[PDB]
Every structure is written in C-alpha cells, then in structure tokens.
Enzyme design. Sequence first.
Site, PDB file in Angstrom:
ATOM      1  N   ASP A  25       0.435  -1.235  -0.247  1.00 28.80           N
ATOM      2  CA  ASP A  25       0.137  -0.375   0.208  1.00 28.80           C
ATOM      3  C   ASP A  25       0.820   1.178   0.091  1.00 28.80           C
ATOM      4  O   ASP A  25       1.491   1.764   1.025  1.00 28.80           O
ATOM      5  CB  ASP A  25      -0.875   0.102   1.418  1.00 28.80           C
ATOM      6  CG  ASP A  25      -1.587   0.792   1.135  1.00 28.80           C
ATOM      7  OD1 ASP A  25      -2.034   2.134   0.497  1.00 28.80           O
ATOM      8  OD2 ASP A  25      -2.648   1.299   2.084  1.00 28.80           O
ATOM      9  N   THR A  26       0.888   1.681  -1.426  1.00 26.01           N
ATOM     10  CA  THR A  26       1.753   2.783  -1.681  1.00 26.01           C
ATOM     11  C   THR A  26       1.003   3.941  -1.046  1.00 26.01           C
ATOM     12  O   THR A  26       1.451   5.621  -0.870  1.00 26.01           O
ATOM     13  CB  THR A  26       2.369   3.637  -3.382  1.00 26.01           C
ATOM     14  OG1 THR A  26       1.066   3.799  -3.705  1.00 26.01           O
ATOM     15  CG2 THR A  26       2.905   2.158  -3.363  1.00 26.01           C
ATOM     16  N   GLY A  27      -0.254   4.662  -0.324  1.00 23.11           N
ATOM     17  CA  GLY A  27      -0.813   5.471   0.410  1.00 23.11           C
ATOM     18  C   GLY A  27      -0.542   4.887   1.702  1.00 23.11           C
ATOM     19  O   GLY A  27      -1.404   6.031   2.481  1.00 23.11           O
TER      20      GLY A  27
END
Lengths: 99, 99
Positions: A25-27
Amino acid sequence: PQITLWKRPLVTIKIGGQLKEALLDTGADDTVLEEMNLPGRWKPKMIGGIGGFIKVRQYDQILIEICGHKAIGTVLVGPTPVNIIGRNLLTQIGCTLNF
Amino acid sequence: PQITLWKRPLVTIKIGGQLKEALLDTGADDTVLEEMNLPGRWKPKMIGGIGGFIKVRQYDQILIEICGHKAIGTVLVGPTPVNIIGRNLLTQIGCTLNF
Ligand SMILES: CC(C)[C@H](NC(=O)[C@H](C)NC(=O)OCc1ccccc1)C(=O)N[C@@H](Cc1ccccc1)[C@@H](O)[C@H](O)[C@H](Cc1ccccc1)NC(=O)[C@@H](NC(=O)[C@H](C)NC(=O)OCc1ccccc1)C(C)C
Ligand SMILES: C[C@H]1CCCC[C@@H]1O
Ligand SMILES: [K+]
Ligand SMILES: [K+]
C-alpha cells in the site's frame, strides 16, 4: 518481481511465526495489521484515513518477511479490515512505482 | 518515471483544466478526489477505509491527466482528506509495483 494493479496487490507476509496475507500500500505511511500479539512493549497511536481515525498499538523494531525479503520497522496492530504494508516497510524491500 | 517511497508519492494531476496534488495509491480500488465540481450526472457509491465508510459521488468517463499521462475513467468525489489516484487509473497509465 513486477506486480500489476488490475487486482489488489496482495502478497504473503511472515510475522511472529505466522503467515498472513497483506496489501502492498503506497498510500499508507505506516504498516497496520489486524489484531495480534507482538513481542516487546507498545504505545497507543491514532491513525486516520477514509472514514476517520482508529486507535492502534504501536510496536517498534519488528522483523517481517515480505515476499521473502526481510525488513525491520514499526508495526501497528488494531481494528483494520485488511493487513496493510505501508511505506515504512515498502522502502526496505526496495519497492517503487513505475510508469 | 520511477517513484521511490521514502516520502508520500504525491504527483500533479490535471482535471477540468485545474492542477491538483494527488496521492498514487496502490491500496485504493478507486480514485477519490476532494470536494470539487465535475460535469454530467453522478450516481451514489459508498467506499470503506480505515475509519469506516463515506458516501461519494460517482462520475464516469472523466478526463484526467496524471503526471502528463492521459486517462479516461471513473472518478469519485466526496469527503476524502486527500486526492487519491486508485488502481482503476494506475492501470490505465501502466503503473506497476516493482522490487
Ligand atoms: C492505512 C492508513 C495507515 C492510511 N493512512 C495514513 O497513511 C495516514 C497516516 N493518515 C493520514 O494522513 O490521514 C489524514 C486524515 C485527516 C483527517 C481525517 C482522516 C485522515 C490510509 O488509510 N491510507 C489510505 C488512503 C488515505 C491516505 C490519507 C488519508 C485518507 C486516506 C489508502 O492508502 C488505503 O490503502 C486504504 C486501506 C484500506 C483498504 C481496504 C479497507 C480498508 C482500508 N484504502 C482505502 O481507504 C480505499 N478503500 C478501498 O479501496 C475500498 C473499496 N475499501 C474496502 O474494501 O473497504 C472494506 C471495509 C470493510 C469494513 C470497514 C471498512 C472498510 C479508499 C481510498 C478508496
Ligand atoms: C521473525 C518474524 C519476522 C518475519 C520473518 C519471520 C517471522 O515471522
Ligand atoms: K510499469
Ligand atoms: K525497484
């Protein structure tokens, strides 16, 4: 490996003996796992997202394996519907976005 | 480009001639933008995040440019604290995770 994004980037992780499924999850600033016990002391933390904030427990210097790549860092544990591998561990395994 | 994850992957997007900052987010199924005005009719959608669920407006076939890459697809609008570019649009621009 190269992971396409047509479906959720779910991978196997290993933490505290257990094999779990987690979302790359880059967010997420932080890594947040469903309720479990971890070694060492913890302290409370609030984390926010879509829908508001939840209270989690923060454990430090936790060892994790993500797709066979080992890393160490802070892991949060609390009432998350999905296991989330956040940027704090994504950097350690050499993960980047490419287009 | 190749985007590392030591900081939030925040990029410039353009929608309706306006520049905005958005988060490239592999943990989001959908693209959700902060309250704004778009043309056309919308339909209801509920989306869940870390803190619970929010109601958003669903707009289809919307033109949006992400770091100079043109995409046309579904954009949600509602009470998100940050502009989020989700997998629906990441796929269109050919974005992958790599390690
Ligand atoms: C995991 C958290 C540590 C992470 N937040 C952060 O990194 C931090 C430190 N927060 C932060 O900056 O917060 C600012 C703020 C300010 C005021 C109020 C609220 C928030 C986060 O929620 N990040 C999300 C984006 C974001 C970032 C900043 C602010 C707000 C949102 C996504 O990357 C992210 O991956 C989550 C993870 C997730 C997936 C699935 C379920 C629950 C959570 N996905 C999402 O929130 C997206 N959801 C989804 O893709 C769908 C469709 N969800 C889903 O399956 O829902 C199932 C569900 C069931 C039951 C309950 C709740 C959900 C959303 C953006 C479209
Ligand atoms: C030691 C603990 C951390 C990740 C690799 C294996 C194990 O579950
Ligand atoms: K790519
Ligand atoms: K890489």
